Amino acid sequence: RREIKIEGDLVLGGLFPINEKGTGTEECGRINEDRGIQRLEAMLFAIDEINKDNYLLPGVKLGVHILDTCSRDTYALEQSLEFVRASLIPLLIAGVIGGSYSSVSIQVANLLRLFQIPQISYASTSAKLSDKSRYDYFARTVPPDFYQAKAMAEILRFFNWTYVSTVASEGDYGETGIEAFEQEARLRNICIATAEKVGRSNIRKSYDSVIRELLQKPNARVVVLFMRSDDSRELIAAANRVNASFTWVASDGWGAQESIVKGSEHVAYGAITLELASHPVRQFDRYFQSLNPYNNHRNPWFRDFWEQKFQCSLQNKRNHRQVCDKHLAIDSSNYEQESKIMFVVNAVYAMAHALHKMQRTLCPQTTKLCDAMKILDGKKLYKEYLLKIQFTAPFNPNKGADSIVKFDTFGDGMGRYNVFNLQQTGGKYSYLKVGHWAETLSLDVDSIHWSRNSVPTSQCSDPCAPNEMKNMQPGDVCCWICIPCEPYEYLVDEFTCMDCGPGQWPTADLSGCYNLPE
Amino acid sequence: FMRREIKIEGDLVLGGLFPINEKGTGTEECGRINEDRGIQRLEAMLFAIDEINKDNYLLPGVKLGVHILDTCSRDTYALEQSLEFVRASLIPLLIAGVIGGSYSSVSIQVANLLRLFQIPQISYASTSAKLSDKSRYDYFARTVPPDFYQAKAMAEILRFFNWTYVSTVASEGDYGETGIEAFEQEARLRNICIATAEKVGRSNIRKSYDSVIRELLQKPNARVVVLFMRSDDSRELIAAANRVNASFTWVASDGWGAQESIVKGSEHVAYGAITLELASHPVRQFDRYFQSLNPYNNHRNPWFRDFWEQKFQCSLQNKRNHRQVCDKHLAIDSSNYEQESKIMFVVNAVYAMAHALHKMQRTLCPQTTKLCDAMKILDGKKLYKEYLLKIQFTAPFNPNKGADSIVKFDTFGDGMGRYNVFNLQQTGGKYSYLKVGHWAETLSLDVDSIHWSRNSVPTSQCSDPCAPNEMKNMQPGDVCCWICIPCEPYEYLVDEFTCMDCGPGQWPTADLSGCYNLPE
């Protein structure tokens, strides 16, 4: 029953998957170090900054009510009830920053709209959230997967991978994510060997069952993944067991997380993953590294985070061993800023800027929460916020690389992705940016380290022998058979054989015919 | 300080929502007691639970409890209350399902909240067609029909008396706005034009209605005004009409229904109005129960006193600093109480839930009649689809079984569409509503018993009638308006729309129906 409650003139609720999904009967599991703790700290950071900022909400201190979602929508929903009971000890909520997993953002949105409470997700990408008739109070600083799906399809179409398999996560993130991909797939002439899908609470066996079915399509050596972070971890693990190997092409669900591949590094080597395009918030690196169990008491999950990151123990852990070195610290050698921090910070500032514009508008005489703002009009706020356009929280250099935060009519953000390749070059395994997708694909093929040192081949049927075989398309448009030709025929084209005619015989290379002597 | 509610423990508990109180004005949330659609409907539920808890063939071995809350006729308030039902599934009583939502707005909002936790809900009065959408309201069902039909009934009454130029005024929201839209679509099909489409909204004050009465008056030919408004809104509109003593022939939906309270203090302005209401047959046993209630025996209903003191203009020692203590011999009876039109639906609703829980308990608990472990934590989704497939004969309180007195649900979870038409009369000095027809699948009403306003069957058409002597009827672009073209002194009317030359030798009759020969 942990939570962060900091009082303020106005309070923002937050939701982060601080903990991984609990297995079996338990609701919460291990600490989600990067996407959980880091993202949570980034919001605390943003709030701190805004509270030192004399040009943004001066005179109005922002407070927070942050809750753990334990990576489960139902859990996130019961937690959220805490935000609405408020509008009746309980803190009034101006708006809610949060929802990492699309499934929780969606469910929380269904609840928050009933009380007209604006919500901004810093990571949920499901296309469903764009539906403003169902999620009329939801915005996000990231784009919908309508685009990430295109980026993936075009990557495949580029390297001519026409026969690929797909495994997706049950839910609003994976299923709609994959569906979008499959549609983009047909359009680019790409067939799906097998469409696998893992679901809720699935145990090892469900995944082992998928690795097999994937292996039952040997020609399909490229497997497209649209799965939850946790699910992706399980699939790569199930592939390690039976030492199965494919070329993975996964969505941001997997992203650039090194934790997903830990303990199976060789099985995911040479994988291509996508992640939202962003640039680290330097000032945040300073803030985070300065954090330790001695100075960070406002984060009730920090000690568990600490003990797990360093394999610690103090006097606040389970009945184990190995006390912890008091000189331990989060620094440049054991920490790398999470890919979406920028979006978390921008989401909090978006809400901040929105409240500020509203405060200047309804409270023209002071910098304080006058009476007209005593009870916020959530509906209005959402459309004083949708029209928001501002330069990325100071923490972003320049202003030319369109570092402006604003929203669609749907409330979404700009669709920019970076393509990564899992490498290991220097003994260690890391993610290298090998391209990106702005509106069209773009990647320097040379820097990509493929699995088995060779640019993968993923086609339904084998290439034809030159010397004679012709390409023959059966009923579909991805599979074909190779029919050798009569020694007197030549290949008028890849698909057709033709008699060279009397007096003539085909050329050694079969491209044409030549006269016969005697 | 004191937010009232009814909490009776049981093996299984049903939540309930009723507009016990009227919408509070201005800053206050709850206002006056809604005697009929409030207290009566509340007591009808307690009545139903009581019967069910004495019934050894229904839920024997399982005692139903209740958690009833006031909606104060406001969706937002209802919503805050409903939170009580879900916090439970985490002092707090576990909710098996919720009986409730009078106003379509509260049902819709509550339905939005309740599906998040798979809690089945049955409304005994909300008629908004939106509720039929099982993709937004997948845990909502209702023992009444969708207004898709009530609108047709209304259009067909107009098309019957040939009222082609009518004005409409709807209440903002999912009840009034979708209701009228439906009507206007049924209007076009039956060639009926709409003079002016007015619409009152949330928190509107006197001036918003007066502004409407005026705009209605600026369409004098349109003497028939179609209403699709909230009960309270209807009260305001008729009050705004009484002020400027304006008078129209009102055709209102069940929002107005057959409530006498809506017309009180303006009886003459609404005389001869036609209103619809869901077709029902009083529940006799309920009459007995309700009349037997008094401030001495009925302590479980925390709103009863206020009800009492207001129905009788009372006082005891539990009222405001007023006067006139009350006669301890007062009592609800045949002379001061009439069963609210929809009570039968409240009872059928509470029973539909019971029957559902009952069939489920027999299925998952094959050994006893008690809530076995399998039902310790109800699967709401399953309940909703053990419930949709429910078909039973109206709680004993309904005679026969031939007039299809079976309660069941559409694939959408709606009930059957049957309405009764009412005429506001006063014949015996007193103003009351008289059933002057009904709509099953086709209209049907004995026009003879209808007491119109200004003793003449209203006329509601776009243009003024033509002068006999010469004018011919001429239809421009539409089929509602027309111009009157007088005819040449040598032409007669071969018919209401055509003028013709009498031809040489002949001349039109004074009458203009024929031609006569010319002398000289």
Ligand SMILES: *[C@@H]1O[C@H](CO)[C@@H](O)[C@H](O)[C@H]1NC(C)=O
């Ligand atoms: C197939 O893909 C290769 C690798 O990029 C490319 O060079 C070639 O032009 C492609 N051919 C087709 C089928 O368009």
Ligand SMILES: *[C@@H]1O[C@H](CO)[C@@H](O)[C@H](O)[C@H]1NC(C)=O
């Ligand atoms: C409606 O108009 C038709 C056509 O003029 C007429 O025959 C019918 O009697 C009218 N109905 C009534 C009762 O007004």
Ligand SMILES: N[C@@]1(C(=O)O)CC[C@@H](C(=O)O)C1
């Ligand atoms: N885009 C994510 C989602 O919508 O669920 C997939 C990974 C999530 C994350 O960044 O943690 C966000």
Ligand SMILES: N[C@@]1(C(=O)O)CC[C@@H](C(=O)O)C1
């Ligand atoms: N059918 C109603 C509605 O949907 O609002 C109109 C009148 C209401 C009532 O009877 O209380 C119910």
